[PDB]
Design a binder for this molecule. Structure first.
Ligand SMILES: *[C@@H]1O[C@H](CO)[C@@H](O)[C@H](O)[C@H]1NC(C)=O
Ligand SMILES: *[C@@H]1O[C@H](CO)[C@@H](O)[C@H](O)[C@H]1NC(C)=O
Ligand SMILES: *[C@@H]1O[C@H](CO)[C@@H](O)[C@H](O)[C@H]1NC(C)=O
Ligand SMILES: *[C@@H]1O[C@H](CO)[C@@H](O)[C@H](O)[C@H]1NC(C)=O
Ligand SMILES: *[C@@H]1O[C@H](CO)[C@@H](O)[C@H](O)[C@H]1NC(C)=O
Ligand SMILES: *[C@@H]1O[C@H](CO)[C@@H](O)[C@H](O)[C@H]1NC(C)=O
Lengths: 320, 49, 187, 310, 49, 44
């Protein structure tokens, strides 16, 4: 993207204020900076010597270029085998963001099929004609018979009372059936518009209507690479490895995607931001996100005690 | 007393059973990584409406 | 507003949902933790108890149904007839025939353990191989088709909310005609 | 030929791959126990007066005659309610802007009030009954019988249907051992294969297709729009299972059978069936209703012509 | 989830609550702690938990 | 000659179909738009 543009700008938000509270707790200094790439970090094979190495945040932390990764660290078994961790500050799971938000005429006449309108019009014309014919053969007269046929239909004859009563009962039972089935259609208008978690055989072998992607070099990709029934889905995900989650939001907003695997509360906050986003209901992999830590260090005890002090009081509710 | 009286006084080894985590319990021993998200809540009668 | 709310209310009493008024899920821990009104039983010394004994998480249902062991299935039919039972593991088509008998006997939708039923046999025998070939010869044609037509396949609204409404309107007419007699005799 | 040509002719030990079971296959080798319920099926493309108002109908007409007789008695005791109360009273059922008369009798107006409240409440119950009819799911289905008169000759009805199978298969032998004439009709309507008949059913180039039931269920749970629907649930069909063929005299047969019985009776086979099947496919104005109302309307025109000529 | 009546739903899911976790309390100086934590991450990170 | 200013009531009373019927002229004016408003009432 950029050839070389690394500028000092302003950074703030949730974990920044968390770091402000941590600097309020213990007496230390720091230097806020960003990771060079836009990737989490995977232990991918480097091109020489046939060795699986790290990159990104772990690539800068293990090289000594970073001191403490302040990030929602996806705590897993592999990264704990190399470094030490801290208390998981965030308790957050996984979910699927989809697009079920299509705006609505409610099928009145222009989306609705034209049987009843033309049928009732021609039928009440036939009714008016035969009422005027019975008015001729009595056992503004034409306008009177036509307006009688309208006023029976309007819903607000010695030998013609039977015809009028059958037409009136017919008109009311038809408009009652139309009211009933329009109401019953717009109440029960909730079709299958979701994935129902990882338990979806259609995502095991997707199609052109099922376009799902993930973040390039993510820990969720490693968690899927552990399980044997996910690499086939990686055959759909290796062609759509997206750099940032904002690119995934832009792709799924322009209907270039159909499903995205992401943490729950972030997507709930974005659904509060953008009203055209509704996630699925099944919550899975209720995980804990902590702070990236180095090895055995004297800044592991009091830091974790400060995390616990933040957990025990209402400061977590303040961060909420 | 209880499991804290058994583990901190070294009559026990560790508490495999469930235990709430707070400040002084984390002072006396070393808790493991968390494995279950168990907060608090309030149960009421909550009759029909 | 009143009559529209009343119409939608009468349309709202009969909204049929999924069955959760009675317990339908087989993986419900309410099966694993029964109550005084969760009376589920089985046939005494049946294959269902053997399938339960093959698994290890079935001791609670065993200690519940050890006081609920039934000799014959007709005892279970008579017990559920007098509303003593609440659940009973049984084969599908026999309960389909029982639902064809009585309409209140209703099965559930979770069809589990779709097993196979054969004939109890001895060891290796000259009356084993040709008999199994005759089983296959009876299965390839429609020998069980008309047998299903006998009892398996062959079984044997405005009406609900009309009786008490008719009686109340008739009583209102009987009271109103007498009130008309009072109003005419007053003048 | 094929797996039968390999196993029976002592070039293959056993057929772990799945295969349908019939008589001569059980003659040449020895199958295992059936581990799955896989029958056959046939894939296709794919009023409101008498069932609803039948016994309420009689009592509502009795109530109508009672209210009309009371109105006539009040009109003759205390302005056209001598014998013309039927049209007025059944217009009071609906109230579709019918100006009739001004009832000066107080009893007639009390009956109008009570009958109007009653009309509101059974109109609400009738709308509730229409919603209750909407609750269950229904579709148009043909006859499920394997001995259909359509199957004898498609000239019996106006669309001639079409049906084929895959060539040289055991389903064809099951047809020829049951109805060779059905094979003669299928020979005129042959096709190529599985996916070719699949595309023919998706695009409408085929009416029916005889195949195994469970594979069609697995393909219909993932069907585009769930249009392709099987016939029944294996009622007038084979309803067989799948086994593992071993050679006649294999010592591994009892161990494999007990291993399959251990696989079934612990939910592990249930776990595999959960993993490898699908169940999402569960089980616009109506057209026949106003058609039957048009038949009743033709009867009404007949009765009106009878009352007009006399 | 095992309630007789099924009429007890608390306020939210831990939004205005403590929202903490449970762990295994080991003594200060136990060498088994890293292996137990790796075993817990193995048990959670495959759907077994 | 009596529904000059009461024509607002003449469109406003039949909304809930229990009003007093007003004598409408035969000049092909009232009953057409009355049926149109009644059909709109059937919609809403
Ligand atoms: C970032 O890159 C874009 C595109 O080259 C450029 O227009 C913009 O000025 C750059 N900003 C910085 C921080 O240099
Ligand atoms: C503690 O904080 C003060 C600023 O308040 C700073 O000058 C000092 O260097 C820090 N170190 C200690 C422990 O004195
Ligand atoms: C290995 O080489 C490729 C280019 O061939 C490039 O991505 C990068 O320099 C190296 N990293 C990996 C593992 O792709
Ligand atoms: C924790 O508290 C202070 C300040 O953070 C630090 O100097 C000290 O070493 C820590 N306590 C122990 C006993 O290590
Ligand atoms: C089965 O039938 C055959 C004749 O078809 C004959 O060998 C004998 O009656 C039976 N043999 C066995 C193996 O049971
Ligand atoms: C298989 O069927 C085809 C017709 O589709 C036929 O030509 C061929 O001979 C058959 N194979 C054998 C060996 O019978």
């Amino acid at each position: 993207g950029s050839p070389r543009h690394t500028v000092p700008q302003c950074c703030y938000g949730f974990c920044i204020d968390l770091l402000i509270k941590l600097a309020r707790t213990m007496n230390f200094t720091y230097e806020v900076h960003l990771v060079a790439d836009g990737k989490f970090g995977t232990q991918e094979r480097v091109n020489n010597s046939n060795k699986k190495e790290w990159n990104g945040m772990m690539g800068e932390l293990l090289s000594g270029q970073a001191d403490m990764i302040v990030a929602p660290l996806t705590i897993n078994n592999e990264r704990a085998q190399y470094i030490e961790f801290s208390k998981p500050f965030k308790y957050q799971g996984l979910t699927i963001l989809v697009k079920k938000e299509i705006p609505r005429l409610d099928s009145f006449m222009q989306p609705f099929q034209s049987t009843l309108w033309l049928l009732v019009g021609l039928s009440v014309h036939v009714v008016a004609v035969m009422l005027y014919l019975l008015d001729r053969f009595s056992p503004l007269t034409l306008s009177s018979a036509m307006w009688f046929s309208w006023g029976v239909l309007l819903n607000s004859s010695f030998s013609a009372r039977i015809l009028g009563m059958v037409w009136a009962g017919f008109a009311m039972i038809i408009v009652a059936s139309y009211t009933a089935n329009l109401a019953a259609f717009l109440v029960l208008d909730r079709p299958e518009e979701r994935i129902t978690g990882i338990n979806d055989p259609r995502l095991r072998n997707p199609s052109d209507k099922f376009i799902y992607a993930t973040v390039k070099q993510s820990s969720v990709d490693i968690y899927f690479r552990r399980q044997v029934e996910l690499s086939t889905m990686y055959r759909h995900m290796e062609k759509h490895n997206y750099e940032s989650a904002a690119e995934a939001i832009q792709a799924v907003r322009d209907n270039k995607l159909h499903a995205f695997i992401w943490d729950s509360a972030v997507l709930e906050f974005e659904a509060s931001q953008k009203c055209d986003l509704v996630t699925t209901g099944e919550l899975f992999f209720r995980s804990g996100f902590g702070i990236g830590m180095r090895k055995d260090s004297p800044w592991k005890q009091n830091v974790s005690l400060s995390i616990l002090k933040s957990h025990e009081n209402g400061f977590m509710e303040d961060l909420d | 007393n209880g499991m804290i009286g058994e583990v901190v006084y070294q009559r026990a080894v560790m508490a495999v059973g469930s235990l709430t985590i707070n400040e002084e319990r984390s002072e006396v021993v070393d808790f493991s990584v968390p494995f279950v998200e168990t907060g608090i809540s309030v149960m009421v009668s909550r009759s029909n409406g | 507003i009143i009559v529209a709310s009343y119409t939608a209310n009468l349309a709202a009493f009969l909204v049929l949902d999924r069955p959760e008024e009675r317990i339908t899920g087989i993986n419900d821990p309410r099966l694993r933790n029964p109550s005084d009104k969760f009376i589920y039983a089985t046939v005494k010394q049946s294959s269902v108890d053997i399938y339960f004994r093959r698994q290890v998480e079935l001791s609670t249902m065993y200690r519940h149904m050890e006081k609920h062991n039934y000799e014959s299935a007709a005892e279970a039919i008579q017990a559920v007839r007098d509303n003593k039972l609440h659940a009973f593991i049984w084969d599908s088509a026999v309960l389909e025939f029982e639902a064809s008998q009585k309409c209140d006997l209703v099965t559930t939708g979770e069809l589990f353990f779709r097993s196979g039923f054969g004939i109890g046999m001895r060891k290796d025998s000259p009356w084993k191989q040709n008999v199994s070939l005759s089983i296959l010869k009876s299965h390839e044609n429609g020998f069980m088709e008309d047998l299903d037509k006998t009892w398996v396949r062959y079984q044997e609204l405005t009406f609900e909310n009309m009786a008490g409404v008719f009686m109340l309107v008739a009583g209102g007419i009987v009271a109103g005609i007498f009130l008309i007699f009072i109003e005419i005799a007053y003048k | 030929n094929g797996m039968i040509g390999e196993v029976v002719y002592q070039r293959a030990v056993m057929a772990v791959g799945s295969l349908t079971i019939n008589e001569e296959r059980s003659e040449v080798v020895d199958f295992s126990v059936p581990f799955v319920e896989t029958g056959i099926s046939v894939m296709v493309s794919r009023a409101f007066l008498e069932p609803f108002s039948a016994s309420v109908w009689v009592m509502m007409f009795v109530m109508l005659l009672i209210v009309s007789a009371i109105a006539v008695f009040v009109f003759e005791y205390f302005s056209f309610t001598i014998g013309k109360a039927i049209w007025l009273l059944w217009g009071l059922v609906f109230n579709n802007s019918v100006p009739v008369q001004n009832p000066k009798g107080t009893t007639s107006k009390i009956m109008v009030s009570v009958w109007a409240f009653f009309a509101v409440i059974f109109l609400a119950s009738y709308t509730a009954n229409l919603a209750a009819f909407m609750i269950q799911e229904e579709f148009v289905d043909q006859v499920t019988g394997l001995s259909d008169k359509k199957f004898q000759r498609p000239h019996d009805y106006s669309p001639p249907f079409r049906f084929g199978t895959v060539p040289n298969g055991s389903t064809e032998r099951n047809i020829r051992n049951n109805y060779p004439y059905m094979h003669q009709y299928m020979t005129r309507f042959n096709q190529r294969g599985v996916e070719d008949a699949l595309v023919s059913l998706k695009t409408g180039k085929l009416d029916a297709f005889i195949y195994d039931a469970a594979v069609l269920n697995y393909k219909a749970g993932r069907d585009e729009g769930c249009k392709l629907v099987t016939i029944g649930s294996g009622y007038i069909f084979a309803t067989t299972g799948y086994g593992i063929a071993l050679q006649k005299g294999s010592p591994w047969k009892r161990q494999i059978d007990l291993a399959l019985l251990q696989f079934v009776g612990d939910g592990e086979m249930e776990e595999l069936e959960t993993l490898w099947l699908t169940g999402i496919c569960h089980n616009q104005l109506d057209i026949d209703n106003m058609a039957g109302v048009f038949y009743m309307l033709a009867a009404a025109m007949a009765l009106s012509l009878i009352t007009f000529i006399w």
